[PDB]
Amino acid sequence: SGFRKMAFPSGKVEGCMVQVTCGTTTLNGLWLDDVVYCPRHVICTSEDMLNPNYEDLLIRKSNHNFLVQAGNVQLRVIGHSMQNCVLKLKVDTANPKTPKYKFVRIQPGQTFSVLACYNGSPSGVYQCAMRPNFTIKGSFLNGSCGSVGFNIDYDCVSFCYMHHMELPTGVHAGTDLEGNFYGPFVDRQTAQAAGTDTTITVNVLAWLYAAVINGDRWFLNRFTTTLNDFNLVAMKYNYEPLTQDHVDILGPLSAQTGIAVLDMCASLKELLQNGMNGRTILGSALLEDEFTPFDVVRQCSGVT
Amino acid sequence: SGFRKMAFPSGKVEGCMVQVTCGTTTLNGLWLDDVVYCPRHVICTSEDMLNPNYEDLLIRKSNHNFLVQAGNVQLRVIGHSMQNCVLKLKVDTANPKTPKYKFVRIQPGQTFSVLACYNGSPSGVYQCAMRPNFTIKGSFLNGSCGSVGFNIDYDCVSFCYMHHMELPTGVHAGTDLEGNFYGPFVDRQTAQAAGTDTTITVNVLAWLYAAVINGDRWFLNRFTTTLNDFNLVAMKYNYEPLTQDHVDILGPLSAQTGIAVLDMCASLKELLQNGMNGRTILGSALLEDEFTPFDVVRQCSGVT
Ligand SMILES: CC(=O)NCc1ccc(S(N)(=O)=O)cc1
Numbered sequence: 376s377g378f379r380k381m382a383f384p385s386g387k388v389e390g391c392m393v394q395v396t397c398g399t400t401t402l403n404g405l406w407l408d409d410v411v412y413c414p415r416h417v418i419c420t421s422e423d424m425l426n427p428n429y430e431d432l433l434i435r436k437s438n439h440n441f442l443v444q445a446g447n448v449q450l451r452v453i454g455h456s457m458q459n460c461v462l463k464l465k466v467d468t469a470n471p472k473t474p475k476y477k478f479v480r481i482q483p484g485q486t487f488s489v490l491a492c493y494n495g496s497p498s499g500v501y502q503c504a505m506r507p508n509f510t511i512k513g514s515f516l517n518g519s520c521g522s523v524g525f526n527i528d529y530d531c532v533s534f535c536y537m538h539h540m541e542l543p544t545g546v547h548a549g550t551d552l553e554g555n556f557y558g559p560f561v562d563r564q565t566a567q568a569a570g571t572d573t574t575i576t577v578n579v580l581a582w583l584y585a586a587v588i589n590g591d592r593w594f595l596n597r598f599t600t601t602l603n604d605f606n607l608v609a610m611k612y613n614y615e616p617l618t619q620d621h622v623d624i625l626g627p628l629s630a631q632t633g634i635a636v637l638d639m640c641a642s643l644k645e646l647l648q649n650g651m652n653g654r655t656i657l658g659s660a661l662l663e664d665e666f667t668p669f670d671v672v673r674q675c676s677g678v679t
Numbered sequence: 680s681g682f683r684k685m686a687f688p689s690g691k692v693e694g695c696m697v698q699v700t701c702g703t704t705t706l707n708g709l710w711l712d713d714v715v716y717c718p719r720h721v722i723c724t725s726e727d728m729l730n731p732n733y734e735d736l737l738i739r740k741s742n743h744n745f746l747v748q749a750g751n752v753q754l755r756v757i758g759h760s761m762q763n764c765v766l767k768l769k770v771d772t773a774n775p776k777t778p779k780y781k782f783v784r785i786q787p788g789q790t791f792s793v794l795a796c797y798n799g800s801p802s803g804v805y806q807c808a809m810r811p812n813f814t815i816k817g818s819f820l821n822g823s824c825g826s827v828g829f830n831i832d833y834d835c836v837s838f839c840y841m842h843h844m845e846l847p848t849g850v851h852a853g854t855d856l857e858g859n860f861y862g863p864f865v866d867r868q869t870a871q872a873a874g875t876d877t878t879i880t881v882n883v884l885a886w887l888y889a890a891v892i893n894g895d896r897w898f899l900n901r902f903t904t905t906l907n908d909f910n911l912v913a914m915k916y917n918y919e920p921l922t923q924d925h926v927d928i929l930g931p932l933s934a935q936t937g938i939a940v941l942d943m944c945a946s947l948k949e950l951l952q953n954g955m956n957g958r959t960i961l962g963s964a965l966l967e968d969e970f971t972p973f974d975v976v977r978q979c980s981g982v983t
């Protein structure tokens with residue numbers, strides 16, 4: 376028993392982290408087979424970042440301008456290309472620690488693990504969610520660009536995020552491993568405001584199920600509601616609308632606990648309207664939305 | 680910027696996890712050099728756990744009764760001994776992935792990473808603290824016994840915890856890697872109540888410093904206090920007494936932020952007396968005490 380914000384074991388990804396240096400800029404790269412993936416802004420001076428023309432900056436760069444170091448050993452770059460906002464550096468050596476892997480573009484509300492890295496060296500691992508405004512709330516200092524987000528299915532690492540920038544509000548923006556930004560963000564040092572950071576309703580419901588499973592049940596009430604009635608309250612409280620797809624996804628937690636999804640919706644509605652009144656749920660004074668229904672099943676069942 | 684509950688990268692420890700089976704009991708072992716460490720209750724039936732005589736149960740066990748599997752490969756057990764509440768199984772093969780390592784017994788308030796494992800396979804990694812009542816608030820299902828807690832200093836894993844039991848209140852108890860329980864707990868299925876779970880004051884102060892550093896400053900007030908005055912409020916709110924040793928440890932965060940430790944104490948005092956009034960700090964509606972001053976410096980500076 377007990378419920379923790381839990382990251383995937385990071386060893387498979389630690390095995391892939393390298394240092395990329397172009398001129399005086401160093402950041403992190405991901406070494407899979409004989410390709411190193413990194414943010415294309417590795418080619419920018421801090422001046423360049425104000426208004427970079429990436430195609431024009433890249434003309435001035437050759438293979439030997441990209442310095443790739445894996446541990447204390449230099450990789451030979453035999454090719455480079457730009458795909459959206461990432462550089463792919465072809466090296467002459469396949470990463471021998473390359474795990475089974477996929478590139479996946481996640482949806483808002485989806486959770487993943489970040490291996491925060493500096494100079495191609497892992498510092499830490501944390502769990503986070505793609506926010507409905509396509510930001511993430513990470514912990515990233517200068518040099519952390521190219522740090523990656525991932526999920527693991529048994530022995531297959533699905534990479535979903537590469538870190539690129541911090542917005543002036545101190546939230547984070549990045550790409551999938553095809554170099555396409557989540558949300559409207561660009562790899563430029565300009566005014567970029569995030570939209571409304573709404574609460575991931577289905578994730579809150581999953582976490583309330585996790586709480587019931589772990590014995591925290593004080594918030595269970597006498598009421599039910601409808602998807603339409605619930606959604607009126609959701610909208611008022613900047614919670615994402617709940618769809619029948621979300622209800623279906625919560626089916627197994629509903630079944631395990633014998634609490635119908637709409638009854639749990641009515642409990643959540645009373646928590647929004649009444650607040651927590653100084654009480655906690657799974658040791659939180661606010662409603663946690665960075666567990667997916669899949670995360671709650673995984674942690675409550677013990678998947679490895 | 681941003682501040683996350685961050686675990687150490689787990690790969691060095693993933694490399695050490697094995698499955699130990701004695702009779703019908705399977706749990707996790709830690710394979711360092713040619714020794715596998717595991718909870719001695721691996722030799723107990725669920726009946727045995729009510730009143731185990733470990734010395735007498737162990738007489739009935741030989742080397743070949745301990746089945747050690749690392750991946751899908753069986754290790755040969757050439758010796759076994761009981762040290763306090765752990766078994767040490769000598770195997771004929773040194774773990775080739777053995778990291779540089781130490782065994783350390785931590786103090787209450789100290790944080791560490793847990794690699795939660797089942798059948799010797801890592802499922803997840805989370806950060807937690809040795810509570811002042813020598814419990815930890817983990818996430819452990821049946822089969823998670825032998826899962827270990829650790830800190831990393833560059834390339835040296837300091838193992839500080841092995842998971843042994845869940846108390847009837849659903850909090851967790853375990854040993855250092857010499858098999859000595861944290862607190863008064865025993866590896867027996869009996870009434871065992873935890874003492875007062877007090878708040879780790881120095882850790883709250885560290886986290887308030889982390890908040891100031893990351894731009895969350897609304898709680899900074901006009902007041903100071905003394906260690907004696909502060910400690911009167913601490914005691915009233917079940918916070919641990921603050922010592923001059925704690926003040927000294929907070930010195931570098933004090934220096935970085937230009938907020939004297941006693942002024943931050945006076946801010947914390949007003950937060951205890953006034954509550955958060957529906958406001959958050961680093962996205963928490965309560966005061967987080969599972970970051971050490973060292974954790975805050977590490978995360979705010981980017982140590983790898
Ligand atoms: C050329 C060769 O034989 N092997 C390639 C290799 C493998 C691992 C690393 S690593 N994980 O130390 O950075 C670096 C280079």
Ligand SMILES: CC(=O)NCc1ccc(S(N)(=O)=O)cc1
Nearest residue numbers: 694749750751752772774775776
């Ligand atoms: C006998 C030998 O040559 N090597 C020992 C060995 C190394 C690694 C593993 S492991 N990490 O697959 O479980 C299992 C056994």
